[PDB]
Design a protein around this ligand. Structure first.
Ligand SMILES: [Cl-]
Ligand SMILES: [Cl-]
Lengths: 192, 187
């Protein structure tokens, strides 16, 4: 119940917290000694483009793009928690929830409600759009894994990331895209 | 399928993660942001900076697409001294190459988004151009703060003098310059 107001100063401060996403490297790459790992905002950027180009006539894509730009936003405060950090699901949720409250309080009421709603939709996976964006997250991530493998000239190195997405995919377009990716990568591995 | 081309499109887009923003590099910024970092916050700005006269989702899309050619041509800075037509020519070729990897409806949609920004042919594109400049001077003051070197990136602010007229962005920029100036006066 803070007293920072909802003027330009608070909007600016909201924007600074958001910019901290540029300086949160994605932890999974850090823990695997990737040189120059992407930021969390790098990751959401490509998810957002993927929402634009991976087709599904049943989905509101404007909402999918917004879910993509908002879903990881709490990491500007809580940091990027990876499976290796062993934070229980409930504790990660509680931290990120508190963070989103703090962040959105800087915005006028209608904007606060809208952003928080989007975050809540994603976190509870309550819509088809939310579930779609969750698979973009996982897809975009193994794509980036294979790109770090290519850049390193170390085919297969980041195998653990592929294994962790086993059976997490069921959207027919993303499923198709993943299968193509795994086939191209598993070919490169055999070549080497 | 489809899929191989889509993947190639995605890998090109991914290169944006590895294009440092050139203006920061030229000013010895440590670990400078990528072009995708820059577009990310611009897209968030389109969501939270008010204007009921604008199609915000179109602004968000313009934000995510406007600098996309840079995955091929790189980030050209003013210091690079590339003529406006030449940069336009290069980015246009790049967008054609990029978008042709997509199905026809998406290829046309995406190219037209980029062209609308490029030609500044809508109220939305003009708005997004001011987010770009605003996002950038905010980022300059952030680098100044992180470096503990206030005012060091003044050239960037000087470069934006008189480029703002959108009422909300103007308020935001005034607020930023007053906070920054106060910090500089203090130090
Ligand atoms: Cl994520
Ligand atoms: Cl830009």
């Amino acid at each position: 119940a803070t007293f920072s107001g909802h003027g330009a100063r608070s909007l600016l401060q909201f924007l600074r917290l958001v910019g901290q996403l540029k300086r949160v490297p994605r932890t999974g790459w850090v823990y695997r000694n990737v040189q120059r790992p992407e930021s969390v905002s790098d990751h959401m950027y490509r998810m957002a483009v993927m929402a634009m180009v991976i087709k599904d006539d049943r989905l509101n894509k404007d909402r999918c793009v917004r879910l993509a730009l908002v879903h990881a936003m709490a990491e500007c405060i809580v940091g990027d928690i990876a499976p290796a950090d062993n934070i229980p699901k409930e504790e990660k949720h509680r931290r990120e929830e508190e963070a989103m409250k703090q962040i959105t309080q800087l915005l006028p009421e209608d904007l606060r409600k809208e952003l928080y709603e989007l975050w809540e939709e994603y976190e509870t996976q309550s819509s088809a759009e939310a579930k779609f964006v969750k698979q973009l997250d996982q897809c975009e991530m193994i794509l980036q894994a294979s790109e770090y493998e290519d850049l390193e000239h170390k085919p297969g190195r980041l195998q653990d990331f592929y294994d962790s997405t086993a059976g997490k995919f069921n959207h027919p377009e993303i499923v198709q895209l993943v299968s193509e990716l795994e086939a191209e990568r598993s070919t490169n591995i055999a070549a080497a």
